[PDB]
């Protein structure tokens, strides 16, 4: 047929391109990578899980860690958003090409989120194909889903040590003064998700543009005032301007009360 949007989801990263999630990494490593590498050990009572759910706040690394395991376990990766916004003529091809192209991992985002959609999903869920699920609100039940996902992993927000290594990782490549304190930034970014840090750095990086006299309007013509922008450094005043603009996202403790209990 004419639906090559599935090939626009396939793949064929690195587990150390991810900062932190040390507990989450060992779980996904034992659950996906090891079973493929020592099958004689992971059979019978040690049969691998065929699916699990990653539940945590938004923007704290669920898609990166999903793609990383696919790279470490040499799995072909299938990424799918839960937005069918006719639609069902894809899952029976996604799972078809997933089983077809050896071991594969299907990551679907926001399972909380087109009528008879869950039909063909469960009708295709119920070689190796490991499904990795992520939701921001695991409170949303639909027990037909909460049943078919036994392992529920809570993936949390970074601590101050993982925050600093994130803040430094984002600022790399960008011109900046040395007077910047990544320890103070880490301390002042308590409660920030992983995506919040990038939004902080993307903001301070362009606060360099805002501290400029915008009357150097120009347009179409390149000005010495615009070749001056290339020399400008991100400074603490930008991070000060960023910290009062970028805010984070009791709110995230519900995933602990949901993953650790029923």
Domain identity same for 30 and 115: yes
CATH number of the domain within which 99 lies: 3.40.50.300
> What's the CA gap between 156 and 20, in Å, rounded?
10
* Resolution value, angstrom units: 3.3
**Is 12 annotated among the ligand-binding residues?**
no
**Is 25 annotated among the ligand-binding residues?**
no
> What's the CA gap between 201 and 91, in Å, rounded?
38
Report angle CA 164, 179, 172 to the nearest 5 degrees.
50
Domain identity same for 103 and 184: no
Domain identity same for 139 and 205: no
**Is 60 annotated among the ligand-binding residues?**
yes
> What's the CA gap between 55 and 261, in Å, rounded?
13
* Domain extent at residue 189: 158-244
**Is 156 annotated among the ligand-binding residues?**
no
Domain identity same for 138 and 231: no
**Is 48 annotated among the ligand-binding residues?**
no
Task: Please tell me what DSSP assigns to residue 101.
Answer: S
**Is 116 annotated among the ligand-binding residues?**
no
Domain identity same for 132 and 162: no
**Is 63 annotated among the ligand-binding residues?**
yes
Length of the chain: 262
**Is 148 annotated among the ligand-binding residues?**
yes
**Is 135 annotated among the ligand-binding residues?**
no
Domain identity same for 172 and 204: yes
Q: How many domains does the chain have?
A: 2
> What's the CA gap between 214 and 108, in Å, rounded?
44
Q: Do the Cβ atoms of 84 and 117 come closer than 8 Å?
A: yes
Domain identity same for 231 and 256: no
**Is 58 annotated among the ligand-binding residues?**
yes
Task: Please tell me what DSSP assigns to residue 20.
Answer: S
Domain identity same for 44 and 143: yes
Domain identity same for 175 and 99: no
């Amino acid at each position: 047929y004419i639906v090559q949007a599935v090939r626009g989801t396939m793949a064929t990263m690195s587990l150390d391109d991810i900062i932190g999630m040390h507990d989450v990494k060992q779980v996904l490593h034992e659950a996906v990578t090891l079973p493929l590498l020592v099958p004689e050990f992971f059979q019978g009572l040690r049969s691998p899980w065929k699916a699990m759910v990653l539940a945590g706040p938004p923007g704290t690394g669920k898609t990166l860690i999903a793609r990383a395991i696919a790279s470490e376990s040499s799995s072909t990766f299938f990424t799918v958003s839960s937005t069918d916004l006719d639609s069902e003529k894809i899952v029976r091809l996604l799972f078809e090409l997933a089983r077809f192209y050896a071991p594969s991992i299907i990551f679907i985002d926001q399972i909380d989120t087109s009528r008879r959609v869950k039909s063909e999903f469960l009708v295709q869920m119920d070689r190796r194909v490991f499904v990795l699920a992520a939701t921001n609100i695991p409170w949303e039940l639909d027990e037909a889903l909460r049943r078919r996902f036994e392992k529920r992993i809570f993936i949390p927000l970074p601590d101050i040590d993982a925050r600093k290594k994130l803040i430094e990782k984002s600022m790399e490549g960008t011109p900046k003064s040395d007077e910047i304190n990544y320890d103070d930034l880490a301390a002042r970014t308590e409660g920030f998700s992983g995506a919040d840090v990038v939004s902080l750095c993307r903001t301070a990086a362009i606060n360099v543009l805002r501290r400029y006299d915008t009357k150097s309007l120009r347009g179409g013509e390149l000005t010495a005032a615009m070749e001056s922008l290339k020399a400008e450094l991100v400074r603490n005043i930008d991070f000060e301007a960023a910290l009062q603009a970028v805010s984070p996202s009791d709110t995230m403790l519900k995933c602990k009360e949901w993953c650790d209990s029923f």
